[PDB]
Amino acid sequence: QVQLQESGPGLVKPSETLSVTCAVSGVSFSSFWWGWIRQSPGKGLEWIGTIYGSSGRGEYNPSLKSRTTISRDTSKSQISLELTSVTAADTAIYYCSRGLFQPATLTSYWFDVWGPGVPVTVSSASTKGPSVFPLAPESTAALGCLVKDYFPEPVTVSWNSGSLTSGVHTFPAVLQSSGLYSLSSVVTVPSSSLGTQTYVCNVNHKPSNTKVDKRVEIK
């Protein structure tokens, strides 16, 4: 019955304010408690706070209260989260939730409905397209492309314009100390097909509007 959908900026610069919103549908907005939970890459889930639809009063995580505002837009049945003075550590998936509580004195909140989550990245990096470098060298051989120093995510990688799909692995991107991302895509092919057949990795980075096609061969 209840449906939650988050929306947000995607990218926030450090020291600015992170703003995300949650559209509540299917049920009475004023009858329940709504709040926010986040999960940072590599860290656990962290409750931010939860407010009553009817009054807007609520409770906040002490760790975050000084930077947090959770408010209602009743004309749209929305709740919003404002997080001020953000830093890279505020990079996270932000989830909208319904908070329930029970007579025990009351319990604190458990969360019976969650939104799908909105990823938000906090970074001072500027948009930059990737450099692409071939990865080149038994029955099977591995070939690949190193896609490095780009921002923001994501890049898409295909092989032979999509005509090579089996045996392809594209690794998760990693954030470098530079603030830029890097990943590799690899494919396994027959050792005997090398030298008589061409392998090309097609890289697309839409934020920078760059497409690179890299031929991967044995030096």
Partner: peptide, 30 residues
């Protein structure tokens, strides 16, 4: 997740993955 008191706090999770036969890696250096 506990919720006896504020703030509610979560564990770091348990991943349940699919068991299969042991397979050695094929190793490549570039």
């Amino acid at each position: 997740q506990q919720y006896i008191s504020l703030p509610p706090t979560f564990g770091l999770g348990t991943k349940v993955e699919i068991k299969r036969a042991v397979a050695a890696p094929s190793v490549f250096i570039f």
